Amino acid sequence: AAKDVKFGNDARVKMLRGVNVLADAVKVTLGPKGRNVVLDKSFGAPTITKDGVSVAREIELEDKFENMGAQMVKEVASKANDAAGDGTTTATVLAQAIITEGLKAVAAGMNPMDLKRGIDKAVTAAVEELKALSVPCSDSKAIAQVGTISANSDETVGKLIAEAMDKVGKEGVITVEDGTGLQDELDVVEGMQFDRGYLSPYFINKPETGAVELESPFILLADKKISNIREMLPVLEAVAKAGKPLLIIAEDVEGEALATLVVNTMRGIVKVAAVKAPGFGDRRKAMLQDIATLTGGTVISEEIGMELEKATLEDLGQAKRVVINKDTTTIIDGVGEEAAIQGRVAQIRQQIEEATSDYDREKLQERVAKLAGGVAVIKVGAATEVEMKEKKARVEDALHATRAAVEEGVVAGGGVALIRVASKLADLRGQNEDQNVGIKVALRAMEAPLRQIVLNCGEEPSVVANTVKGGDGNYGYNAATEEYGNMIDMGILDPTKVTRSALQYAASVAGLMITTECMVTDLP
Amino acid sequence: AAKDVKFGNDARVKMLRGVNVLADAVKVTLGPKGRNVVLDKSFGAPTITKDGVSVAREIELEDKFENMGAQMVKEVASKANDAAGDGTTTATVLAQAIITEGLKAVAAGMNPMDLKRGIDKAVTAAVEELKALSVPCSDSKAIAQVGTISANSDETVGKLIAEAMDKVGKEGVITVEDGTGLQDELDVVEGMQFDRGYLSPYFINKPETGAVELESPFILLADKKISNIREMLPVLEAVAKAGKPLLIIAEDVEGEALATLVVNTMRGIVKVAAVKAPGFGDRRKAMLQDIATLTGGTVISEEIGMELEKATLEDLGQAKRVVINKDTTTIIDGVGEEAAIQGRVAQIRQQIEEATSDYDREKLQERVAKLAGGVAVIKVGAATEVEMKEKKARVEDALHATRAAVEEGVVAGGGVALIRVASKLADLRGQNEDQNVGIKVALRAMEAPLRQIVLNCGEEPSVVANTVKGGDGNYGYNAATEEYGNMIDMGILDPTKVTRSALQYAASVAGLMITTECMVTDLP
Amino acid sequence: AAKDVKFGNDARVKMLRGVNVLADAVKVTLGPKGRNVVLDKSFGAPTITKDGVSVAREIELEDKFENMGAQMVKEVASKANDAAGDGTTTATVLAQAIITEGLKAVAAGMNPMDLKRGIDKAVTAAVEELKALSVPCSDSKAIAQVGTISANSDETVGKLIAEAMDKVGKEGVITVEDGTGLQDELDVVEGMQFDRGYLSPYFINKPETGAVELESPFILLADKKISNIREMLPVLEAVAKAGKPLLIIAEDVEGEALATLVVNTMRGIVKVAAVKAPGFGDRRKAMLQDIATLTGGTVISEEIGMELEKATLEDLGQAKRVVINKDTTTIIDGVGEEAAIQGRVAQIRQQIEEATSDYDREKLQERVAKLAGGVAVIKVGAATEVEMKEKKARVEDALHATRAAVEEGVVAGGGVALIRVASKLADLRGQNEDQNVGIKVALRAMEAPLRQIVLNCGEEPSVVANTVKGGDGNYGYNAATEEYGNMIDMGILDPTKVTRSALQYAASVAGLMITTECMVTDLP
Ligand SMILES: Nc1ncnc2c1ncn2[C@@H]1O[C@H](COP(=O)(O)OP(=O)(O)OP(=O)(O)O)[C@@H](O)[C@H]1O
Ligand SMILES: Nc1ncnc2c1ncn2[C@@H]1O[C@H](COP(=O)(O)OP(=O)(O)OP(=O)(O)O)[C@@H](O)[C@H]1O
Ligand SMILES: Nc1ncnc2c1ncn2[C@@H]1O[C@H](COP(=O)(O)OP(=O)(O)OP(=O)(O)O)[C@@H](O)[C@H]1O
Ligand SMILES: [K+]
Ligand SMILES: [K+]
Ligand SMILES: [K+]
Ligand SMILES: [Mg+2]
Ligand SMILES: [Mg+2]
Ligand SMILES: [Mg+2]
């Protein structure tokens, strides 16, 4: 359609107006004194959130050029959320500061390309300095502090996340879901607990618990789906001769085979329980093989070549305990080779490295957590759905921040790491004066998060920033107590990954934004 | 529908207004000091680009006659992008200059047809002079300089493209795709690496790598799809007698045949791996034949006449190494006749010459790069998607410019080649004074790119153009450093093909545009 | 009424837009190649003029802030017209250039007050350098060149003005009026020619000429008005005894006195002619006293004390010749003391110095021109009234420029004097960097007149300015011939007063304009 074209100061001014609208909606959420933003939803009640990414996602302006700027600067928060899951508001603040200072420089007549190059050089040096300044975060105390800070100072959330990570270990998985109660609950399950229940309610050995409990049972892992008892009769006869119980993991057991297994279950010749194999095509086989590796068994398939009529007790797997319920199947202490379990885990790790999809890699990591480590569910407790959504967002931010901290370490919070980095980079220079000015605007924007935190607390951002800069190391300003001190000692920690990601994405977007001279959009 | 008709100076003025709108949106991107244009997208975030073709494609005006002019002059950028992949902004600037001067001449009362004829004669002479002035660009240093200049002075992009061309050779292929990391990555694969993985995960000889590795295996190339082991049993028996591994390239191996091959793979009688043939109908056969030529084998087909029961070891191909993964199959050092490989490559070259489709010719060239030469992928590294798009556009422009340079050579950049060409053509004359004036306006427009570069740098275009014209040879003006010198020595090079294509397309469109006396469009 | 208030870049941008509208309407008139502007008049036909002051006076914009800027920058042209009567377009161009560069500096973040101070310092130094570079313009050839240049190269106007000044001398007066013919006419009258005709038509001594001609007559200067012959009878009797004619200069002669004088005129006893005294109250007495000083007589008044009955021949003045017509009275070679005439002229000069009104000082200068020197009228010849107005404006500009040249000298035209002044002031510095930048913008704007002249001629302003700056002394660019040479030799001269006044007024207005941060106006 017909296009409105704007040039020079007019287009840049409208772009900055939109960026400022979005960043002003977002930055009110920054800091422990940060406020909440209510986002109207066309469906359901409004969402009250302290997430800059959510606020930015909702922002959209009538003016096409202002909306253009808002959309461009919203990529910063979106990318920060995608990568680190935290620091979206900080990244938006950094992008707004960089855009403002760079547009000042552009109106000053400096080359926008050189300003962008200087910003990029300053940000690269700042990332290197952040890596140097970062310290490993392996202690549960530091992890709890990081989670508490990322959850808007919810010590309960921080300590719960620390406990969950301690329980599940390095290779473990943690997920966040809704809770029925008012309190946050942690549910940790070890080993395999794939979500497949008994195929027949009459397999229940223990009625008062409504669950099948097998002690030292064999495990028969069948890739095919079975409807007749003939193909398995040798296996059931061998199991009955052995005397121990049996668990079948199959695509489907139904009809004559299922009925015969059930009848034998009452008759007591064999304590047999059957369940569906977990997952679906091209993943069911993988999970069956992981169970085989855990239990020291082999998967019976037609592709592999073996037949069920020829299956033997040695072919069958072994585990110490098994608990089936209507919902989930759990195998406890599968009798399998530890070297083999680690080899399979390494293969799944290689698959995760090869993977390029978030869903694929998280499913692979869930498989790793089932094989080794454990799986934890944090049920967020809230009285209402709006509170549930807000607390779930905060808990997810805390979990993401803790993962970032373990992955890349921690730095002083409250915008102190960026302040120190800029102080170290004061001597940095570019190829020309425009690049030097770009470096300087990047360094000055590095102070934007702390200044915005102070502003939201209501104090004087310039005074606080000057005091922090005069300080050294981890010395900083506590927004909660409105005092100064060592941020590490006070427990105000930010993941180095979060800070670096915010800086990087904000710098890229803001540099390209300031390099703009024309804006083309649809007419009103 | 009812039509608005405009005549003479009014129609030409509206046409020029639209052309000027488009060219003003586009030309701000010209030069190292050129700025970026933000294009609103109805879907997704706005696109920040320095590409005149993209800007022109987005341009569209409310006024029907202005939009008419914009659309006509947009063909210049579109055709330049299609042919050379670079110089779109230069072509648009040239078209705008030619249109402006020619419309001045038309208002001056000269014959527009004679002006167009003079412009065409001047452009033909200018193309001949560009060919004379061009120098071959075979050195990796010149290639890197060309890529760096076309990538808005990204030495990293230039050197990466130079390395990729050095690795893949003349007949090699290079493509540009998105990258997950922040840095630009180069991935070069030699020989055949068609994207077909193992048909059965259990073929993996090396589990820690999750890949099949065959040393000196035979290759059985089957055009048909196979589901039974009977037709192949003689071949498998011969292979087992030989003792070396075997790779099957077929339309599909499934069911009994696949299962038997897999079972034999564990049993160790024959180290057999099977994969799908690459491509689809009417291309699968061609790629199978190229693999046969590479490996010194023969393709088994029903059309050709041979049967698989009668296939022999001599019929089977031979290669030194083979590596299969879930994603791709790679054959290393196929034992085939070099004369035959060159003959097949020449046949594919003849097919490329006969081809009239970009997709067909690029697929044929990919086949050539698989047979001989190699295939390179440049994964563009960017922190955000907008930066990724901008950097990918710049890298594609650099790759296109480097290909143009190798194809047709290089000339002095910064609008210096056109300046020198016009100086050489100062004595050119037409059949009449109107043709002479058309020649003169074409020559004056030849200076438009340099003047626009200077204007974007903020200096005085007339002074810079006068100094460059007073200079001789490759003497020019460095927009980046705002100094004068030998453009070749400074590394400011433009492909002769890019310059010639921009000039030619701009001249054709602009001449026809100035020859206009009436414009017919839909009413508002 | 309610007010719209605008701040910062928005207000300055609107101010600059209005200034640019006015300056663009005005600057098309600059140069020998300068064009004419047609100004619609609510009454009468439109006025075609090449006067920047007239164009600016007519300019008025719909937007209140743009109109604000236009009105402020119109003061420059108005003040230049009031002071020098020429250089209005040059002053407007200088103001526009200063405003543009200073607003660039302001957007650059420099202090507007310091920019204004630097501009003022640069302009003071430039005025001093203009005074140093100026050369006296006392030769009629230089005067004619100046007039020709100021009349848009009308050699006829220049030579006519040179002849008029040569005739009337230094203390003479020149005025411009409409002419009935197609050719410009010069009418010079020496001595006293006050516009008072014979009180009675029958005084005509020469009927074929319809005028009174008296040879060596006495002059009776009466401050009172007379209606009876008794008070004068002794004087008439003495005159009749003497035998020479008599001229009465009185407030009014009527009734019995006039009738008796007329009757005696026929009877021939006394050749008496009577006329009204010139001017009105508080000026009639002064002009009567100047006539008395010229003719060596005394004014008869009641305030002074003498009575007409006691007046004598010695009291009566003496002159060599007298010519009265219905329109004007002229006295030729009044017999008065030269020392006295110079003393009265010096007294009138002191009165001119004390005077603070243009009308008062021009009337005093007319009295000086009547006493000594002469009075010249240039009747502008034109075929139509529009041509008459245009040519009269050009002739008035030429006269003002010639007066400025005699008063303060001449400098090289075509914007060369300002170029040389800026070159000399290149080393000038202020108290701070903002003042230095203000100096630099003033120096760059000093080049604006030459660049605008070149632009109106259609050539390259930057190239022409560079060539002129590379030149030295009076070397410049001839807009008429589009060649370079010594402007003095080519006859392209501009009054130093005109150039200095344009620079000063433009600098003052532009500095104050750039020092603006808020604009308050009425709402739309
Ligand atoms: N008590 C505190 N004193 C000082 N700074 C604090 C304190 N608590 C938190 N902060 C800082 O507040 C900053 C912003 O945290 P917040 O969770 O509000 O937003 P964010 O990290 O920018 O992003 P998101 O909106 O995605 O959660 C963090 O950098 C943290 O360092
Ligand atoms: N440092 C430099 N000095 C002088 N000229 C330069 C310099 N760098 C690039 N140029 C010139 O800039 C001109 C424009 O390059 P640019 O990549 O901006 O646009 P283009 O080639 O017209 O088209 P496209 O928009 O499709 O990339 C090229 O002709 C190149 O010669
Ligand atoms: N032949 C010429 N070559 C170069 N410059 C010339 C020539 N003739 C005139 N000029 C310059 O043209 C400039 C502008 O003259 P012009 O009479 O058009 O306007 P002005 O002096 O700015 O003001 P005004 O509009 O009040 O007359 C003068 O400075 C004069 O020096
Ligand atoms: K927040
Ligand atoms: K471009
Ligand atoms: K003028
Ligand atoms: Mg947070
Ligand atoms: Mg390019
Ligand atoms: Mg003039």
Swiss-Prot record, chains A, B, C:
Biological processes annotated in GO: chaperone cofactor-dependent protein refolding; protein folding; protein refolding; response to heat; response to radiation; virion assembly
Residues annotated as binding ATP: 29-32, 50, 86-90, 414, 478-480, 494
Domain of life the protein comes from: Bacteria
GO MF entries: ATP binding; ATP hydrolysis activity; ATP-dependent protein folding chaperone; identical protein binding; isomerase activity; magnesium ion binding; unfolded protein binding
EC code: 5.6.1.7
First-level EC class: isomerase
Residues recorded with modification N6-succinyllysine: K33, K50, K116, K276, K320, K389
InterPro entries noted in UniProt: Chaperonin_Cpn60_CS, Cpn60/GroEL, Cpn60/GroEL/TCP-1, GroEL-like_apical_dom_sf, GROEL-like_equatorial_sf, TCP-1-like_intermed_sf
Subcellular localization: Cytoplasm
GO cellular component: cytosol; GroEL-GroES complex; membrane
Activity regulation, per record: During the substrate-folding cycle, the two GroEL rings separate for effective substrate binding and chaperonin activity. Ring separation is triggered by ATP binding to the trans ring of the asymmetric GroEL:GroES complex and avoids formation of functionally impaired symmetric GroEL:GroES2 complexes. Activity of the GroEL-GroES chaperonin complex requires Mg-ATP. UMPylation of the chaperone by SelO/YdiU negatively regulates its activity, and may facilitate survival under stress conditions.
Residues modified to N6-acetyllysine: K116
CDD domains: GroEL (cd03344)
Catalytic reaction list: ATP + H2O + a folded polypeptide = ADP + phosphate + an unfolded polypeptide
Keywords for the protein's UniProt record, in alphabetical order: Acetylation, ATP-binding, Chaperone, Cytoplasm, Isomerase, Nucleotide-binding
Maturation and modification: Phosphorylated reversibly during heat shock.
Family under the similarity heading: Belongs to the chaperonin (HSP60) family.
Assembly and oligomerization: Forms a cylinder of 14 subunits composed of two heptameric rings stacked back-to-back. Interacts with the co-chaperonin GroES. Can form asymmetrical complexes, composed of one GroEL and one GroES, and symmetrical complexes, formed between one GroEL and two GroES oligomers. The asymmetrical complex is the functional unit. It was suggested that the symmetric heterooligomer may represent a transient intermediate in the chaperonin protein folding cycle.
PANTHER family: 60 KDA HEAT SHOCK PROTEIN, MITOCHONDRIAL
Function: Together with its co-chaperonin GroES, plays an essential role in assisting protein folding. The GroEL-GroES system forms a nano-cage that allows encapsulation of the non-native substrate proteins and provides a physical environment optimized to promote and accelerate protein folding, probably by preventing aggregation and by entropically destabilizing folding intermediates. Also plays a role in coupling between replication of the F plasmid and cell division of the cell.
Domain characteristics, as noted in the entry: Each subunit is composed of an apical domain that binds non-folded proteins and GroES, an intermediate domain and an equatorial domain that binds ATP and is involved in inter-ring interactions. Forms a large central channel that appears to traverse the entire length of the cylinder with no obstruction. The central channel of GroEL functions as two cavities, one in each ring, that are separated from each other by the crystallographically disordered 23-amino-acid C-terminal segments of the seven subunits. The entry and exit of polypeptide seem to be restricted to the apical end of each ring. Modulating the volume of the GroEL central cavity affects folding speed in accordance with confinement theory. Small proteins fold more rapidly as the size of the cage is gradually reduced to a point where restriction in space slows folding dramatically. For larger proteins, either expanding or reducing cage volume decelerate folding. A stepwise reduction in cage size results in a gradual loss of cell viability.
Full protein name: Chaperonin GroEL
Upper classification of the organism: Bacteria, Pseudomonadati, Pseudomonadota, Gammaproteobacteria, Enterobacterales
